[PDB]
Design a protein around this ligand. Sequence first.
Ligand SMILES: Nc1nc2c(ncn2[C@@H]2O[C@H](COP(=O)(O)OP(=O)(O)OP(=O)(O)O)[C@@H](O)[C@H]2O)c(=O)[nH]1
Ligand SMILES: Nc1nc2c(ncn2[C@@H]2O[C@H](COP(=O)(O)OP(=O)(O)O)[C@@H](O)[C@H]2O)c(=O)[nH]1
Ligand SMILES: Nc1nc2c(ncn2[C@@H]2O[C@H](COP(=O)(O)OP(=O)(O)O)[C@@H](O)[C@H]2O)c(=O)[nH]1
Ligand SMILES: [Mg+2]
Ligand SMILES: [Mg+2]
Lengths: 436, 427, 426, 431, 52, 92
Amino acid sequence: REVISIHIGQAGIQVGNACWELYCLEHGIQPDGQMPSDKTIGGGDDAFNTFFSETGAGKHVPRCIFLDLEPTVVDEVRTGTYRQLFHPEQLISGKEDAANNFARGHYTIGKEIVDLALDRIRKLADNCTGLQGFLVFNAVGGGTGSGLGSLLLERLSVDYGKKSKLGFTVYPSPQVSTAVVEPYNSVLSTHSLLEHTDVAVMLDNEAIYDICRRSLDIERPTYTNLNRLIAQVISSLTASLRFDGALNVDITEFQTNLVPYPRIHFMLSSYAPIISAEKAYHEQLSVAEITNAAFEPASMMVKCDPRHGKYMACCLMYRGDVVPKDVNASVATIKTKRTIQFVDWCPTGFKCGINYQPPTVVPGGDLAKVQRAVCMISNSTAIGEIFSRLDHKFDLMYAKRAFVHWYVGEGMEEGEFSEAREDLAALEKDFEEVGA
Amino acid sequence: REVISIHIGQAGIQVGNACWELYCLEHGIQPDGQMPDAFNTFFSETGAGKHVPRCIFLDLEPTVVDEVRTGTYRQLFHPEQLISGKEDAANNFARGHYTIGKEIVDLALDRIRKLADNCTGLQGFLVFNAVGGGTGSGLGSLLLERLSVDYGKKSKLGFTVYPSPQVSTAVVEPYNSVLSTHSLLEHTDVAVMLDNEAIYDICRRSLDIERPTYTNLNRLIAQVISSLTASLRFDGALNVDITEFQTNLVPYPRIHFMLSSYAPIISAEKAYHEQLSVAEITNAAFEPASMMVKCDPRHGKYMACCLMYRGDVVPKDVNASVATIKTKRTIQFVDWCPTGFKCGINYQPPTVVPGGDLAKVQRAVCMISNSTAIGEIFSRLDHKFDLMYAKRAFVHWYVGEGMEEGEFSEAREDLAALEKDFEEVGA
Amino acid sequence: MREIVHIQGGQCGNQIGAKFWEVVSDEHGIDPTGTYHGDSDLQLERINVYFNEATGGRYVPRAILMDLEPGTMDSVRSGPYGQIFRPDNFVFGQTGAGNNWAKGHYTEGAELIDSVLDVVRKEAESCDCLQGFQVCHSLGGGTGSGMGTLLISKIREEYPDRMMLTFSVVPSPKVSDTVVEPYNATLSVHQLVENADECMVLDNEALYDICFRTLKLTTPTFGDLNHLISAVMSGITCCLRFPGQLNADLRKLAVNLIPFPRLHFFMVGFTPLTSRGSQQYRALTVPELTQQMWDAKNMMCAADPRHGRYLTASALFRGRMSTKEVDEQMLNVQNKNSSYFVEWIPNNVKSSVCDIPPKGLKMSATFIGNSTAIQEMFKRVSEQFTAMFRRKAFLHWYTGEGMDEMEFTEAESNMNDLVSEYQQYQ
Amino acid sequence: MREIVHIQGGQCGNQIGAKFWEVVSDEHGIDPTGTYHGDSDLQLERINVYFNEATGGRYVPRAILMDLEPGTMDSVRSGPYGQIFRPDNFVFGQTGAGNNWAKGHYTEGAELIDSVLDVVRKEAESCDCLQGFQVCHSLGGGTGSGMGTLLISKIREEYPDRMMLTFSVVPSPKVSDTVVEPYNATLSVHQLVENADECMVLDNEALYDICFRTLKLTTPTFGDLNHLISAVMSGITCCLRFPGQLNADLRKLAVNLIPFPRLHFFMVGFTPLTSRGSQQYRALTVPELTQQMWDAKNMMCAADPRHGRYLTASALFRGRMSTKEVDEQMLNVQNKNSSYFVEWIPNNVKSSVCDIPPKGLKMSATFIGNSTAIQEMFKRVSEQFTAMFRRKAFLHWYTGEGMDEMEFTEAESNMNDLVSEYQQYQDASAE
Amino acid sequence: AATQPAALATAENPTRTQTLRPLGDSGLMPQPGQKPKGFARDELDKPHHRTG
Amino acid sequence: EAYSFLDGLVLELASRPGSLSLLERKLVTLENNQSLMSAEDFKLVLRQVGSQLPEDGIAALLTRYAPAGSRPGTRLDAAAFRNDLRAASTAA
Ligand SMILES: Nc1nc2c(ncn2[C@@H]2O[C@H](COP(=O)(O)OP(=O)(O)OP(=O)(O)O)[C@@H](O)[C@H]2O)c(=O)[nH]1
Ligand SMILES: Nc1nc2c(ncn2[C@@H]2O[C@H](COP(=O)(O)OP(=O)(O)O)[C@@H](O)[C@H]2O)c(=O)[nH]1
Ligand SMILES: Nc1nc2c(ncn2[C@@H]2O[C@H](COP(=O)(O)OP(=O)(O)O)[C@@H](O)[C@H]2O)c(=O)[nH]1
Ligand SMILES: [Mg+2]
Ligand SMILES: [Mg+2]
């Protein structure tokens, strides 16, 4: 069993830098490449194989490619501490940026590098034997992540087919944002993320900022803490594949028990307990309260209120000192609360996953070392209001044809703007009808 | 079984500071938070080797909460439980009821649920606040309303502080008290009356402390709370739980106001000479000069009585004492309540706080009765409320916040109806 | 053979049953660990009535303990002879009734009586010939009065032919604990007058008077009162457990004390009862037992029989004795004060003899008198009920649970007709 | 001579089989090495029913392991008695059904069913007289439910006369793990009601209830539930392996418990189960065995017997016992509680006696009672199934694999008239 | 200043007031009516009751 | 001579083994914003942890680890004292 991850854009490979540091610290791989100790604890031998491939020996190269158009961050990765770990051929870097332009990175610049990305990922999959599926990281506000990501996912779909492609994207927050023309990129990314991504996990940046200011009490949080939280989420997500548990769940479990229809795949992420080191000592750690904290909107990774929507299906990943009895009791407790409701579509809208190894802690990080944790992935109808909220401010811009001359010059036209608007409206209608 | 306490305003959290100090002293918990199972109703066995109270401090002025955060019990309190606002209501019911509260109350009642789910045998809530202030009166009423709508059937006891008849520390406290009691009527289950001059007199005449501060007042209020929770906490011969108060002390749903008393309130030097027995400590718990409220039930008629006994007490002695009390005609009961007593016996003696002014005793009494002099209290407050309302003083403060005069008149007539009900029931 | 199954309700019932089981275990010679260590063979033949052979001479009491608060069970398990009760017999609720008849009779009884019925049906069907049921509880508390009454009615519906005893304590105005005692007492009595087979009324003030005047104790804790009640209860079923010159089972006592089925409220006394200081200076003869048994100040009820008529009477005797002296004393007490006995029933006293006295004693006696003075306390409770119910005090706690005014009205209606017939037969 | 072959499906099936083989290998006194170390000479004479003699007093279980994820192979060889199975019997694919009935019944089961069919045909013909097939599996997963029932069917058209046991656990809403449990469960029941000879219904909810109330354990993991299931599975087949006063083969119980061919759903109980705290208050008598055997709280199914009627019942007793006491206890329990037993079948209770008790015990019992209250759980599953299927939730994962909408409707209709048959037979009059 | 010396004093000689039981004028022991410590409470706080 | 007092303290804390790790936790948790501890708080912690040390020894320890610029007996450097206590604990 193996999974290969591709990181698109400037933020994508920063998230990858956090994730791979966490993986190397968790699997005990020295950043030069080799494992000092051959003995293993917990998951057992051959555990590292799903992330690291046994190349020659004394090295374990990750099954990832960093692809980006601006060379500065890729060269910073090349020059930093992890020179020997990453292969020189996997850090794909372009020569000029896409410049927040979906058209530029989708028609002009992406065409010369997507072929190299594909013919490297082809041999990455060839080296594999039990590929569960792909999973991607990108931000739809940029040019490379939004523009090139669409083409890369389309070509991956046409080259492989029904293979799982988990989408961990980063949407612009409704109030706090960094760019100006990003509604165009986001909408033109949605028009293909609808039909190409198998499971899409939403991640707003302001929600994690609120989590850090509120829970971990770093009054000046930067992108590194956000990336570390994303890495913790992904690790708690793949711990079932990596290590042994009571009820292990693989990748093709999520699509079966969280996707009621092929065009409805949008997951709110949640994590518990996100607590500081000092708060960790006065607060008890048991399944009940960490499960309760996993459904509160104040600890969600996306700025939306699930109380305005109806839960369709939920997924619960457990780590550490967790046994079936107390998680069963906790999930029974949740169903009694009438504050949160489940759609009548699915009475048993729960799926639990239990692992035994507690999440690891990184020196310099802010999360505390805890006995247990919960990673929650659910499907509800707040995605409908999120999309319409972005749609309104996208339609504000297009009425005056602002910034449209940039896109048309690269080689696209204005028809796909209209069809993306119509696709978003149809998605809103679909979500509303499903909510009934 | 567990009980969680909520404290509102500058008075509530100081009373909590005394109460939790007493609780930690009783169960042998170090101020750090760990011992060197009877404590389960107050403390939670969090993580490894730590006890955290089931309490929240919420206030709008940050100074007192912050000073609590740096006091002796820094690591005793779970840090997110101590809620602290950004700016106070400044003795304005409307300001703390319409403008500031809507932001802090939601987080407060979200976090109380983080305590309720931990609880498995939650007996009920109990609130500490003073209606004289702004955030205790205004925001407190909203918090109690949302507790009532959110939970409903669970008990919500109350130990409020109305302004004392002549001695007071503010000017606009009649408005705050009236607009607070209008909601205190139909939201709290049992309300325990507490004034300041009564406690000052108790500390002056009995404990002969010439210059008492709020510390002694809070200490003995904590003593009363501990004596009324000891039945749930420790083991006794014949105990009473929280529900017993609402079963045997409120004959009607709209009459829940309790006069409190405590005995023996004695110092160290007088403890040696007095032969403290059940009879006289029961007698002292009935004199008007040893009550926590500046009112005389001799003007009214007793409707019920609750007696709490701690330590070296036997049922025969309390039965003899209650018989002697019942035979006395200086105090008179209402005709329709022939058996208006309810005795509670516990074996754990009251603990002494080092540096405090109370002494070691073998037995103690905490009396909580229902009478009709509380209608006199409300009428005396209403007199001076209507005195200054005629010329509409300070009203421009309230109207600007968002309220109107409809609330003033409706609270006034609600208080008048309360007086009518109290005088009718006492017939 | 004939089997007695024990049922305990409330804190009072639990303490009374604990003392009763300690006394019985002492009589039959089993240690607090549960193993037989007695001397005579008479202590083996008739111990099935109370215990069950487990293994290696281990006997488990035939008891079911009922309550709604963990304190009573914890105190029962903590005390001596607390390691002989089977844990499955500790049927147990969680929330507590708390001095409210309605909670223990309509709401809390609903989800708890199913387990109590399950355990009592499981144990009762285990034995071959159930002599009857035995219940000790209280009419002041909530889980003892309401839940116990519901269980009584359920057993009467389930096993109708079997006997049933009810050792129920009734609170008194002089020694009064709870404010709402009349509300529970009147309705519990209203249910008992049709449900229970025969009732023997206990009262705490009478026990206090007995322990003050007779035993001359200065601090009569609940231990002494429970000891007196346990001795009385053990004395009742002594003939079933040991041979005698004239045996008498529970039905034999009931048939000789109930001429009309609605008159089953007995007033009880025990003898001998002497202080430790005056223990040396008394001779131990049949007249010394008879003169104290008939004394009004020895009765464990709050009713003076001199204000009424001994409609029927009974006497249980323990020890190697002369039947001639027993009969002569009974005839003497019958013929001396002829005004205290009813006219249309001659020979109102039923006598029985057992040759095995309680441990540490050579002679003992027990009295069960169905007098028409038992209606004094019924009026004493109904007057408070009418005085408080006329103003609907504390009624909103009863009405807002399922009960309405009709239950109350029927309660004093049955109270009045019972007391009226008791007065009529005087 | 009378031979039972064992088939294990899915993770739950493999763990249940591991516990069952541990307890059976302990019963016949063979060490985890695989050689004989027992004391009594009565064990060696009847070990051919479960073990084949390999070499030098070494016996290998007559078991087949079948599932789709290597973690279960790691788990099987992790505990003791993990090196006694023959490696050739580990028929195994590696894709994983993934909680999908269609994957384990049409896509992945189609090609891997032939290898396991080869294995079971090779192992079944290696012995003389097959008593029947025994399968333990689940109705919630994909590799245990779909593949398991397809193998059930295949054996059924291959061997039509042999007996067939199915120890299957059915998911419950009280303890629900996955989302699509009714979708798999309804179709698995649809296939079982037509293929399996008789089904011995288990449930994790009742097992947790037993381990919490009766045993009063602190952390009842899956090990305790699998131990209870293994104890039942050992108790049911005791008569073949040991002599007794009244023997009872599987076919005898099947004919004495099944009045009509479609009524082959039973509920399970075991006796005795006492907490170590209550251990020194216990007695060792037949009455306390029948007192806990008939208790509604001891049933390993989430269906209350007092909500229906007892069509037939059976009890398997082990240990040195008197037939008179067993007969009189059965007669008394039949006559006293006379309203819970069906009227047109007199003498509803069948009994058997064995002389060899399980290791560490002096006496024991096992209950297999065909009741009409077992349709309570079928309705409880069908209501969720029709709640989901009314508006086609998660249907694309099944119809996008080869299945059609007709199969779901036929499964609903068959489950519905099965519960209707149970109801009609419950309310039937003797005249 | 009110709390610090109190904490120092209670830390200097930490003695917890044990529950004293009044002795009756008899050989019998008081045997308190209730107790908040025992296995019944421990059974009550078991978390498995929440699932049903 | 506070070094001998520290050796006596660590030798005393060698017994009752739970008392050694508790004192470092008390120092860290009760620490100020900086690595400062009051003398009253230090004596309170020493009494709470179960160590009975003469007041002159406490004064000597305070003087040895007093932060620069303060009254010689008003405060104590928590971090330095804890770090030097770690070496003494690991030495025995
Ligand atoms: N018994 C007692 N009363 C107190 C205490 N502290 C304050 N009070 C009373 O509370 C009244 C005013 O309410 P406060 O709590 O002080 O003020 P507040 O509730 O914070 O309202 P704002 O000042 O407007 O924010 C005063 O008149 C005091 O008599 C205390 O510690 N003990
Ligand atoms: N004789 C006797 N009376 C008792 C005992 N314990 C309590 N009582 C009486 O029972 C009354 C209260 O009963 P209560 O505890 O409320 O019963 P419950 O609520 O049903 O469990 C009090 O008036 C006591 O006098 C006992 O051990 N012996
Ligand atoms: N009794 C018992 N139940 C189990 C065991 N393992 C899993 N289960 C139950 O089986 C259900 C899911 O089965 P699953 O693991 O998907 O089986 P598979 O995928 O077909 O191999 C869950 O609800 C579990 O409660 C076990 O060892 N014993
Ligand atoms: Mg970019
Ligand atoms: Mg203030």
